[PDB]
Amino acid sequence: VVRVEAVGQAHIHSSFNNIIISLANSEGQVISWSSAGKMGFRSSKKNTPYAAQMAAQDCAKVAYDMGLRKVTVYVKGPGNGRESAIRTIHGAGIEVMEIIDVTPMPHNGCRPPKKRR
Amino acid sequence: MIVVPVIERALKRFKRKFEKTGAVRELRARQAFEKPSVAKRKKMQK
Amino acid sequence: RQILPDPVYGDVRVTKFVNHLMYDGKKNTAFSIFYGALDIVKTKHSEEKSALEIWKAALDNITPQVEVKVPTEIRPERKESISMKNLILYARKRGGKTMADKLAAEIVDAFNNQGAAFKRKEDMHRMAEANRAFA
Amino acid sequence: YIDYKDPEFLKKFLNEQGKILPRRITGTSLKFQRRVAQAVKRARHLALLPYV
């Protein structure tokens, strides 16, 4: 039981190891999602623009045939491929409205986990 | 919270805004812990 | 280096193929092998075409496109060299009575789109498409 | 004495993200820069400028 009428929000959660693209309606209810690991890029190449393009194309094709036409992009986390995903969901029928970087930064919060040697 | 209202020009603008903000630099900094002595000595050497 | 036209057809590709075919400097033997092979080719697939046209079509069929150094494009000269070398090598590997017969059989198979050289080309294409991300 | 009010005045020393600009970017001197930072933080506490 979902209902996405005309416009929605795309969420990209990237990191140094993987990228997850998830499209949702105005109430943040996900209708489709994809990732490099889902596409089958289990390697160091999970953080590749090609993998991001493949995942974004799959997600956009899966979600376009549901009434989704316009989307607003939110991006969290670093990593190559966010631009590729944005371009792919822009060119796969879905029209982008704005690009918003919601990457969370701390105002000196909790302690980071040590340092690798 | 970098906002780039709007595709190649928009993507270039978003990348430039992100680079100007320096979110990736602070993310790389926050990936690990640095001692206050280490930070102070790095600042003194720089 | 300079390449002499073929005595029969006036081609440089034919001379290059014979150069690939030649053992120990016996160019007369290599030429005899090539001309014989063309003769069995024309006697077997006798096809609204020619004898040299089938050979050229076979070389074009078994030529590869990209090569993983990450995949990359191939120069035309290296493409032609590797096509000729593959045809000759698999003709040598396959069984048969004489070298002319083996070469004619492999040329006919390559034209008819199946054979060991085509299998090698298809495998190279698969190994090339496997690494599309790093390109 | 820079007032924590006049937020429109206060944005003169802030960047597009709302952060406080370095003293080297503008011409401020240390005492004025300290007063500006104090006023900005007071207004952020009073919810006159955004924290982000």
From Swiss-Prot, chain A:
Pfam families: Ribosomal_S11 (PF00411). Keywords: Ribonucleoprotein, Ribosomal protein, RNA-binding, rRNA-binding. InterPro entries: Ribosomal_uS11, Ribosomal_uS11_bac-type, Ribosomal_uS11_CS, Ribosomal_uS11_sf. GO terms for cellular component: ribonucleoprotein complex; ribosome. GO terms for molecular function: rRNA binding; structural constituent of ribosome. Located on the platform of the 30S subunit, it bridges several disparate RNA helices of the 16S rRNA. Forms part of the Shine-Dalgarno cleft in the 70S ribosome. Belongs to the universal ribosomal protein uS11 family. PANTHER family: 40S RIBOSOMAL PROTEIN S14/30S RIBOSOMAL PROTEIN S11. This is Small ribosomal subunit protein uS11. It comes from Porphyromonas gingivalis (strain ATCC 33277 / DSM 20709 / CIP 103683 / JCM 12257 / NCTC 11834 / 2561). The gene is rpsK.
UniProtKB/Swiss-Prot annotation, chain B:
GO terms for cellular component: ribonucleoprotein complex; ribosome. GO terms for biological process: translation. One of its GO terms (molecular function) is structural constituent of ribosome. Keywords: Ribonucleoprotein, Ribosomal protein. Belongs to the bacterial ribosomal protein bS21 family. This is Small ribosomal subunit protein bS21. The chain holds residues 1 to 51 of 63 of the full protein.
UniProtKB/Swiss-Prot annotation, chain C:
GO terms for molecular function: rRNA binding; structural constituent of ribosome; tRNA binding. GO terms for cellular component: small ribosomal subunit. Gene3D superfamilies: Ribosomal protein S7 domain. GO terms for biological process: translation. Keywords: Ribonucleoprotein, Ribosomal protein, RNA-binding, rRNA-binding, tRNA-binding. It comes from the Bacteria. Belongs to the universal ribosomal protein uS7 family. One of the primary rRNA binding proteins, it binds directly to 16S rRNA where it nucleates assembly of the head domain of the 30S subunit. Is located at the subunit interface close to the decoding center, probably blocks exit of the E-site tRNA. Part of the 30S ribosomal subunit. Contacts proteins S9 and S11. This is Small ribosomal subunit protein uS7. It comes from Porphyromonas gingivalis (strain ATCC BAA-308 / W83). The lineage of its organism: Bacteria, Pseudomonadati, Bacteroidota, Bacteroidia, Bacteroidales.
UniProtKB/Swiss-Prot annotation, chain D:
One of its GO terms (molecular function) is structural constituent of ribosome. One of its GO terms (cellular component) is cytosolic small ribosomal subunit. GO terms for biological process: translation. Keywords: Ribonucleoprotein, Ribosomal protein, RNA-binding, rRNA-binding. Binds as a heterodimer with protein bS6 to the central domain of the 16S rRNA, where it helps stabilize the platform of the 30S subunit. Part of the 30S ribosomal subunit. Forms a tight heterodimer with protein bS6. Belongs to the bacterial ribosomal protein bS18 family. This is Small ribosomal subunit protein bS18. It comes from Porphyromonas gingivalis (strain ATCC 33277 / DSM 20709 / CIP 103683 / JCM 12257 / NCTC 11834 / 2561). The chain holds residues 34 to 85 of 90 of the full protein.
